[PDB]
Amino acid sequence: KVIESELQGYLSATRSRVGRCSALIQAASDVQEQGAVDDRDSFLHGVRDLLSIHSNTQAGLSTYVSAPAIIQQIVALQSDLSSLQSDLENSLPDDRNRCINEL
Amino acid sequence: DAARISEVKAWLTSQFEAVGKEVPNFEYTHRSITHLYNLATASQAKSQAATIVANDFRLKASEYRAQAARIREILESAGMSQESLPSNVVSSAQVLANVANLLNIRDTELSSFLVAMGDISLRKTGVEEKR
Amino acid sequence: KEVSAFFQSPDNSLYMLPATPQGLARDPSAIPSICRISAALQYPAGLEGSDASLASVLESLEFCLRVRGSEACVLEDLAKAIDLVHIRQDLVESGHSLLD
Amino acid sequence: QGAAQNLPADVNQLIDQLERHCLAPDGSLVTKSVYSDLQLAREEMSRERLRYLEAMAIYCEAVAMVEEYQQAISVANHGGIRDVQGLYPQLGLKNSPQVYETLEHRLVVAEAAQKLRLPLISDGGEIHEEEIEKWLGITPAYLSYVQLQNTISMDMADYQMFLAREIEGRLKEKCDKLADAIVDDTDSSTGNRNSSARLPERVKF
Amino acid sequence: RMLEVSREEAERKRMLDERANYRHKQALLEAYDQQCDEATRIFAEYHKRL
Numbered sequence: 293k294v295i296e297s298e299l300q301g302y303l304s305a306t307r308s309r310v311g312r313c314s315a316l317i318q319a320a321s322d323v324q325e326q327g328a329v330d331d332r333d334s335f336l337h338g339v340r341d342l343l344s345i346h347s348n349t350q351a352g353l354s355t356y357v358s359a360p361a362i363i364q365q366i367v368a369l370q371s372d373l374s375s376l377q378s379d380l381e382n383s384l385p386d387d388r389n390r391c392i393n394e395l
Numbered sequence: 396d397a398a399r400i401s402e403v404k405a406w407l408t409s410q411f412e413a414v415g416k417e418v419p420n421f422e423y424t425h426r427s428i429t430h431l432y433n434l435a436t437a438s439q440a441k442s443q444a445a446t447i448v449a450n451d452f453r454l455k456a457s458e459y460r461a462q463a464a465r466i467r468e469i470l471e472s473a474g475m476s477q478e479s480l481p482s483n484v485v486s487s488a489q490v491l492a493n494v495a496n497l498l499n500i501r502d503t504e505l506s507s508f509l510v511a512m513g514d515i516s517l518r519k520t521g522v523e524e525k526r
Numbered sequence: 527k528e529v530s531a532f533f534q535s536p537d538n539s540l541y542m543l544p545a546t547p548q549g550l551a552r553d554p555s556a557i558p559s560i561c562r563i564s565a566a567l568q569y570p571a572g573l574e575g576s577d578a579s580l581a582s583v584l585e586s587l588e589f590c591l592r593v594r595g596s597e598a599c600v601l602e603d604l605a606k607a608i609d610l611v612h613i614r615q616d617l618v619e620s621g622h623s624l625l626d
Numbered sequence: 627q628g629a630a631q632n633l634p635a636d637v638n639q640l641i642d643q644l645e646r647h648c649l650a651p652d653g654s655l656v657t658k659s660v661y662s663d664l665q666l667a668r669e670e671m672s673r674e675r676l677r678y679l680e681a682m683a684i685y686c687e688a689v690a691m692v693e694e695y696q697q698a699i700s701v702a703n704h705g706g707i708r709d710v711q712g713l714y715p716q717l718g719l720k721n722s723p724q725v726y727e728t729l730e731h732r733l734v735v736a737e738a739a740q741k742l743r744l745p746l747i748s749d750g751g752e753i754h755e756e757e758i759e760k761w762l763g764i765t766p767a768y769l770s771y772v773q774l775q776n777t778i779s780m781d782m783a784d785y786q787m788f789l790a791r792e793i794e795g796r797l798k799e800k801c802d803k804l805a806d807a808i809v810d811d812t813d814s815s816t817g818n819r820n821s822s823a824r825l826p827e828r829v830k831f
Numbered sequence: 832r833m834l835e836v837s838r839e840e841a842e843r844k845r846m847l848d849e850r851a852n853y854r855h856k857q858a859l860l861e862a863y864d865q866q867c868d869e870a871t872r873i874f875a876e877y878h879k880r881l
Binding site for chain 5: 686764
């Protein structure tokens, strides 16, 4: 009689082997998923490069490429805004002053 | 059609007769066929497929269901308490869960700290003095 | 069972710890606590967490967007800033049009 | 100096005409679908934010009651100085935790699939493996089902003392504490007073 | 001054929500110990010699 109860107790021992990948993943998933982690924050980078969000980076460039090769986004996101300021009379204030000052 | 139908197929559920007026809106997508080489992923993931994983979630809402499971036990421990379900757990867990903290408390108390306090307080300050 | 218990007895007792953070347990929902509420959480895992902890260096040369585009869209501004970058784009050119 | 106007201006101006060129199509729908994500990105998280935010009062402080229970369980061996302050408040603050311990018990076999599964209607696949985890522990409890039925009935009277001391104070500690953090965006210094008064009006701000 | 790090929040879900239902795991540990117990059950009277 007990073996049937022993087998059922053994059944739960081996049935939990299906759940063997249920607990340790919490520490594992928190680290190994950095590819998608940067991807979700890559669309964040899609917002920042606003001079390019209107054409391509909103869909497949910033939100996807910038996750693994984040070094690319360092120049791919500052350029379209550091030129924005630079062309917003920030890198040529002396010219703009005197061009108006002569006026 | 993908770029506009994403804005339409949600509205198209209540626009059966108005299909004939949003179909002309569909061809505005074929303008972005060249962009669709890298815009097809977010073409549907713009309004309806973006409000499931991209913008409404961006994966943040994926766990925001997951926590409340164990929390239900403390709730139901006072929930099977018919004199404590509305008095204690409904009146304390949901008061900051109904209207207030939907978009600025997405962690314990820090989502406002790094975004609202962090950048949403400082985003204007980033440029509004330099330019 | 002992071979299993050598790899299963830790599981059940430990798994009550990720009961509430079962999102952190499951693969398709650990990202929010590793990306979304993580633009400061990834500081201890700075090498691992380049998602938004590196946004400052990402805008190190972009000094206008230093304290603006660093940790904004990580939780709430990914739905609100994007609508307001086209008005920025069309008004910054008006700031370019003043030069014009 | 004829070309000095469009040389800097057209760097972003070409994007401007591109934005008008990509307005209707997906190129600038990213700036026009989020024009609806003011409410379109807040339709599905909000119903799940509540699950996260009803968790606020519980997984942050209504579990922080267990320091009245955990220190006796844990600190009593490693540290004796805190051990004298571990089981002392346990006789009052964690006395209902002993009743709550039965409330932990009764859910495992009965309300695990009814309460620890309710806020995951869409996340039903992953909870089931966690549920079948907690459910597989009832197989030895199949031999002790008698204690799993009358526990709730005996807890009817414990509920009054379960709510008078355990679920009354620290559950409300976290509802107002975290209502402060949101308010602090625009007004941070005096938000602690208005944590329970200016909580709803700040998110819209 | 972004010196907040929500890793505490990631552990706030982890720190003590385990103890809020500390007895879920013991039910499964009883199941895991059941095979130990049932083996002990079948090693009780005649297999006491074992």
